[PDB]
Amino acid sequence: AKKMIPIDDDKLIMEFKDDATAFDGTKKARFKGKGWLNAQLSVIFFKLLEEHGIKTHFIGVAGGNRLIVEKLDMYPLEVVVRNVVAGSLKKRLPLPEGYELPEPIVELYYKNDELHDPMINYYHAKVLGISLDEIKKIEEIALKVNEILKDYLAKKGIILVDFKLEFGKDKDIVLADEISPDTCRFWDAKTKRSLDKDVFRFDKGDLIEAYKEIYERITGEKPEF
Amino acid sequence: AKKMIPIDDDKLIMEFKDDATAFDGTKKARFKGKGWLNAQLSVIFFKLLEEHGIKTHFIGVAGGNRLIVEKLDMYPLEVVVRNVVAGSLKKRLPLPEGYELPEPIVELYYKNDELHDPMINYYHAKVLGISLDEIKKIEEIALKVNEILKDYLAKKGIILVDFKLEFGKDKNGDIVLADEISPDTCRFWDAKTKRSLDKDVFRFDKGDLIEAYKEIYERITGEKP
Amino acid sequence: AKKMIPIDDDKLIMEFKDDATAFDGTKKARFKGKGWLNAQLSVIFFKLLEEHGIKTHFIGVAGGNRLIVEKLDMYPLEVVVRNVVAGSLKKRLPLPEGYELPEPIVELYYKNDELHDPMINYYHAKVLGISLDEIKKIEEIALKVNEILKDYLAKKGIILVDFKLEFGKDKNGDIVLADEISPDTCRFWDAKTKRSLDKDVFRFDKGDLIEAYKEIYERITGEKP
Amino acid sequence: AKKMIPIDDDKLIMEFKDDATAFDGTKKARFKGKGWLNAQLSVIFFKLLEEHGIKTHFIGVAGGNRLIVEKLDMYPLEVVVRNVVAGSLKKRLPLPEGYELPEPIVELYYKNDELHDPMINYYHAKVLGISLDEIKKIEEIALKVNEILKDYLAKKGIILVDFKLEFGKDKDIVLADEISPDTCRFWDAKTKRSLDKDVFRFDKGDLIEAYKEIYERITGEKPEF
Amino acid sequence: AKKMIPIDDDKLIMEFKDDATAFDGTKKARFKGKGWLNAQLSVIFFKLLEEHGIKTHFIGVAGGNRLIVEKLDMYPLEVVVRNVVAGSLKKRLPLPEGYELPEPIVELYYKNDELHDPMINYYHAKVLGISLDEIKKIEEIALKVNEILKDYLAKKGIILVDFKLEFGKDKNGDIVLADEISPDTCRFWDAKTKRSLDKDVFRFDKGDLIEAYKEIYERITGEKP
Amino acid sequence: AKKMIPIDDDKLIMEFKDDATAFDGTKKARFKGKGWLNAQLSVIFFKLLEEHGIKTHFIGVAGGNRLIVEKLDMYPLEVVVRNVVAGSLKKRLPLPEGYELPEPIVELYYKNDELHDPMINYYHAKVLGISLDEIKKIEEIALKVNEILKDYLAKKGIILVDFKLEFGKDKDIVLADEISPDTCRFWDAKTKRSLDKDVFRFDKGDLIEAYKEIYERITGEKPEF
Incomplete structure (x- = not known):
């Protein structure tokens, strides 16, 4: 895409x-x-x-x-921030779909199509070459980014349920890839219907x-165009 | 068992x-x-x-x-310490079986038969009620325990590949190591041959x-x- | 009042x-x-x-x-949290009225009618008896409170420009939010029009x-x- | 001057x-x-x-x-260290002129003739581009400088009541501007008379x-000359 | 004595x-x-x-x-604070007698007549039962005490060259300064002449x-x- | 040598x-x-x-x-890590020869033939130009090195009693000098006889x-050769 x-x-x-x-x-x-x-x-x-x-x-x-x-110089990471319980977070915590998290959750994934993007922690992250300091900065940026996107979308009746970020190093740690309904989960605030790729993944509409x-x-x- | x-x-x-x-x-x-x-x-x-x-x-x-x-007062955790790449760590890192980790890895699992013990991080841990301080102490105890067991077994030609700990809180609020420590809950390999001297032998019918x-x-x- | x-x-x-x-x-x-x-x-x-x-x-x-x-046991503090440049913050920073701060600002005022509530820092705070630890906790509570109030009001087209909190210590030693939270102690602007929906209306006769x-x-x- | x-x-x-x-x-x-x-x-x-x-x-x-x-590369800061209660510190703390502070106080001022040098804290300091780390180093240098000047002057029957410092960045944080009775308050230890610019500010002598x-x-x- | x-x-x-x-x-x-x-x-x-x-x-x-x-409950410590190079510090640093240290030095001695009070570090300290936290507090108290004694004596033309403190724990768990503070346990030099006004006079027969x-x-x- | x-x-x-x-x-x-x-x-x-x-x-x-x-760019340090009580550690702690330390001990020595390599702490280390951060990194490397050498030698029935390391700065802190029975104490695990320079120092064998x-x-x- x-x-x-x-x-x-x-x-x-x-x-x-x-x-x-x-x-x-x-x-x-x-x-x-x-x-x-x-x-x-x-x-x-x-x-x-x-x-x-x-x-x-x-x-x-x-x-x-x-x-x-x-x-x-890209980090081999897919970093996911979550405000609302959805998708695979159901497989990890005993909480129903739609539950509002008291704090945002950050998850780290090793970007690797073959291993199908497995979750890692700080110890795996080090093995893959990412230092604890870099990790801490990456999570802090993500949560800062999470707060700006969430507040911005909420004013317009949109729930930022979760989203994925990628990062790299300029020649400083830099937010990369894309930010689109391909990489975020958006719900209408009133209805809770998806306004993101989940619509295509599960044929729930246009x-x-x-x-x-x-x-x-x-x-x-x-x-327009 | x-x-x-x-x-x-x-x-x-x-x-x-x-x-x-x-x-x-x-x-x-x-x-x-x-x-x-x-x-x-x-x-x-x-x-x-x-x-x-x-x-x-x-x-x-x-x-x-x-x-x-x-x-x-038990923590809903299975805590895994890893010295050598084996099992599901292969699904998580691009490393062959038997590879000696430069440092031990600590993983946290939400103890829940239903979700089939999913892996969690510090953020999930908090959601389940475990503070960052407790987590830090749990990991430090686990790594201390890892070093004492590993050194001890290695003198006897036994490799502590990995193992699982559980913990709980006594009535002073002190964090206490619990459950068992046996070839059911550790991976031991003979140092010379690399054969299993643990439950893996039963899991995969590789001997008596x-x-x-x-x-x-x-x-x-x-x-x- | x-x-x-x-x-x-x-x-x-x-x-x-x-x-x-x-x-x-x-x-x-x-x-x-x-x-x-x-x-x-x-x-x-x-x-x-x-x-x-x-x-x-x-x-x-x-x-x-x-x-x-x-x-x-009350802290002799008025604690101010600021999202948007208004009032006396204009006297302190080279920024026009209505400018959206990239992060919230926390100010500490010595609560004293005589000195007309002067601004203090951590060093003055200690002199008045408030440890650095309490201060840090006070500011963290205030910023947590700032985020919950701001998000909540903004969904309803209300801007939390700034507001003042007071705090005290209960008899476990826990720090507790006190006084009031009302249009007497916050600055609210209509999101569309930017008019005041607070005491500023009375202060400056800008309406009912x-x-x-x-x-x-x-x-x-x-x-x- | x-x-x-x-x-x-x-x-x-x-x-x-x-x-x-x-x-x-x-x-x-x-x-x-x-x-x-x-x-x-x-x-x-x-x-x-x-x-x-x-x-x-x-x-x-x-x-x-x-x-x-x-x-x-100069910081837009006037940094004031105070050992003894004098001047505008009276407007900020309930303490009489001459009171010996149990610890030195550091205050930060935004260097800006138009706003008439307003006091700021760490949050304002960030807005103006100064990081928390820089701030911490600036305060530490100031207090180190405060201790050397105070001990040195005290042996000669002179009280370092307070003084102002400026700092900048070489191409390391570097103490700048001047250190003179224009920028410090000195009192005779025995008499408490000013031996600094206060003599000119308030016509208290030659x-x-x-x-x-x-x-x-x-x-x-x-x-001499 | x-x-x-x-x-x-x-x-x-x-x-x-x-x-x-x-x-x-x-x-x-x-x-x-x-x-x-x-x-x-x-x-x-x-x-x-x-x-x-x-x-x-x-x-x-x-x-x-x-x-x-x-x-x-006494700590088995003799704690030495040093402002000016004298005595055994000559055996440890390439510095002449009387050299003014840029910062005070804190040394720890295991109090033991038999081992003739050997010098220890934080690692030895732990072995003897003293946690890193206690150590840090002991050194901070000692340096606070060093500053109050040094400033006070220097106004009277007396140099606090070095001195020895002991400490113990009272029954709240608070760390408490103990033993004595006298010309038996400090090195004082006249500021003008540099002669000793302490036990060194008896140690080396340099006067009355x-x-x-x-x-x-x-x-x-x-x-x- | x-x-x-x-x-x-x-x-x-x-x-x-x-x-x-x-x-x-x-x-x-x-x-x-x-x-x-x-x-x-x-x-x-x-x-x-x-x-x-x-x-x-x-x-x-x-x-x-x-x-x-x-x-x-070499640090003027000889850094000693100790697992087992031997040599001059006897003069510093009330423990018999051969006693297994519960944690490794790190000691710092000023490399200086004339002062016959005197022990220093972090304060002396600073005077000699080594910052607290460098020190902390040097000790951490040493203990990491201690763990790898100790585990490696122990499998082969050899006790790493203690050893000396030197370090320098590349143009990152870098382990230097040598690692040999000249600079380590090795004991046979079974017999406790020396397999190092102590054999020559005290004529205890070949x-x-x-x-x-x-x-x-x-x-x-x-x-061979």
Whole structure:
């Protein structure tokens, strides 16, 4: 759903596609507009966070579905922040779906398609080369990012249930990858319906529909091109 | 394989049985002698650790397969310490079986038969009620225990690959090591051959269980049971 | 605007009045309903915070304008938390009115009518008897309280610009939030218009006080008093 | 009373004048010798501190009233250390003039003529770009400097009541500006009369008189040229 | 030179004698007045420190050469604080006699006549039962005491070169300064001449002991005994 | 027993000799093979530690008795780690020879032939220019190194009683000098006889004999050339 195209040593282009993928490829479809929407929600989000002094890889926009992003020495981590009990958190804690966590939970995953992204802790993280200090900073950034996204979305009747972040090191630790309904769980505050990729993962409705809603609610206008 | 029989408010009897169980009960057998051997290896281990000022629940022996143990407010934790890459750690790190970790790894499992003992971090731990301070103390005790057991077994040509501890709180608020310490709950490999001298022998039918446990016992005490 | 009536050693009555005071008494008026509204917004706030395990002095309600509150060893502090640049923070930082702070600011005031509540730091705090540990805890509680109030009001289109807390010590030695939490002690702005819905309306004659406080109440409870 | 004349990228000349200024310019005079005395007490002080491994901007002397000083990236801070209750500390704490503080007090001021140097804390300091770590180091240096100046002056019957410091960053945090009866409060130990700029601020005697005394008591000789 | 006479469980009498001892008893003499002077300088010092909230064992005076002191669980420590290079510190650092240390040095000695008071570190300290926390507190008290004694003596032209403290635990668990504080246990030099006004005068026959101690007393109290 | 021959700015040759020295030169002999054995046990040890990510000065082997070693800014420290009570530790603690320490002890010595390597603490260490942070890292490395050497030697029936380390700073803190029976105390686990330089220091047997034993027990082959 994303392709990374190198420019030079400092920067590259991140290209958002219309291809949507679930369950390791076994489920696939294409949604006209998804790429544009995802790139654009990413820009909105990265700029919002950068307003609060969050350092992000975002440099500029290169057309509707392409971002220009600074080049990074990437951590082999997928970091998940959770405000509301959903998905695999059910398999880990005795709490029903939708339960509001008293504090956000940070989970670390070793980014590794083959091991199917296994959860690790600080000891595994060290083995993979990430120091305790880096870890602590990564978690602190994530929770700072969690607070800004959650408060921002909540004012617009959107629940940030959870989301995934990636990070890398500039030549300082830097937030990377994307921030889109591909990588977050959003629920309508009133209804609790998904407005994210879960709609496609579990055929609970129209995907392009739900993503346009996010876009509409944030910008206050329908999606163009 | 263990039955807890209450006595009063301060203490209880832990009774080691000959029934052996794997894979949630779908694999079962009985090994004459296993109970006695497990109780006795536990006494040896608890007393050795208590020599180094490790607080344990062990009070005394009540016949060959029963231990008298102090009654605790138990942590809903299974704590795993790992010196050598084996088992599920292969699913978590890109490392072959038998690889010697540069430092020991500590993992936390939410003790819950239903969720099949899922792995948790400090954030999940708090949700379940365990403060960061208790966690830190639990991990430090576990690593202290890991060092005493590992050094001791290695002098006798035994590798402490990994092992599982449980803990509870006594009525001063002190954190206390509990459950058992036996070839049911540790991974021991012969140093020369790398064969298992633990429950793995029963789990995977790689030989005679009673045989491997007698070996542990023989190598430790120096006496053939 | 508040009168403290002692009951016994553990508890007292806090009574909210209709008398409103500004600029050390040189400006005064009476607003029919103000007392009832302030008592009631305080109950709402204390109970909301107590839902998140914030320890407060609130025990129960004793009629429309009286609260039953637990008796404390009070800190000679007024603690101010700030999300948005307003008031005297303009005199302290080169920032326009309405500027959104990237993080909340905590200020400490020595509670003393004579010195007209001067600002102090940790060093002054110690001189007055408050240890560095207590200070740290006070600021952490205040920031926790700031986050719960801010998120809650913002869902209802209300900006928590700033607010003042007081604290005291109960008879376990636990630090306890006290005084009141009302449009007398917070700065609330309508999110869309930025008008004041607090005492600033009375301080600077920018409208109808009873009107703005009823608004807070209406938006929160959803019921017109 | 000081003029900064640039040389190059690494260094500059600090020139001490005879012009004395109080209350933002509204009070002014000229004192023949003041510039010379101030430069010379600065040298004495900077060299004394540099004896104890305090890093200072002082490089050399360039004539009687000119110092050669290393160029710095300056903190927008005026940092005040206080041993004895005097001046505006009276407006902040319920203590009489002359009271000996049980510990020195450090106060931070935002250096800003327009806001008339307002007091800030660690949160304001961050907003202005100064990290908590820098702050902590700045305070630690100040208190180290406070101890050396206080002990040194006390042996010569002089009380270091308080004083102001400025700091900057070399290309390490470095003590800067000046250290003179313009920037410290000195009291005669026996009499409690001022031997500093307070003499000029409040017309309590002859300024050039009091400064010569400091010089005389320190060096053990009258002032030349 | 001191005899401890038990009274009861809370308190005892410390009695200062005229017998003076050096080099493990191989050098001995008697100085009429020494006991009285040592008891009295100790009272002065303990009361001065107790003015700054230093907890000491001093309860009251019981005649000219006896002190009433609170009974303690004593640390097997002699703790030495050093401002100026003298004695055995010459054997440890490449520094001439009289060199002024940039910071005070704290040394720990295992109090044991047999091993002739060997120097230990934190690791030896633990072996002997003293936790790292107690050690840290002991050193912080010692450095606080060092600063109060040093400043006080220096105003009177006396250099606190070094001195030895002992400590014990009272029955709240609070750490308490004990033994004595006298020219037997400190090194004092006249500021101008650098001659000794302490036991060094007796140790090395460099003058009249009773003479130097009377000097300390005279300079402090201002009264000739 | 070692000669340092410079190559260039990054590296040098460490040459192991057959000359053995004790008691500052007053005792000397030559042992054919000692140099070879010492170089070779050093290589074994440095490579073993470097397997665990311990940074060492070892670069390569240059013939049987010469090591190629990276050039360092050396700490003026001899750091001693002790597992078992022996030598001068007897003069510092009331414990018999051979007593197993409950935790390893780290001692610091100022490397200085003239002062005959005196013990220092953290305060002396600072005076000599070593910061508290460096010290803490040096001790942590030493204890990590202590654990790897001790466990490794214990499996082969050898007790690591104590040993000395030196460290320096690359252009990171780096383990340096040598690791040989010249710089460690080894005891046979069964007999408690020395297998180190103590054999030569106190004429308790054949030196070349004991060192060959270490070599034999480690490699599993007799010594060649």
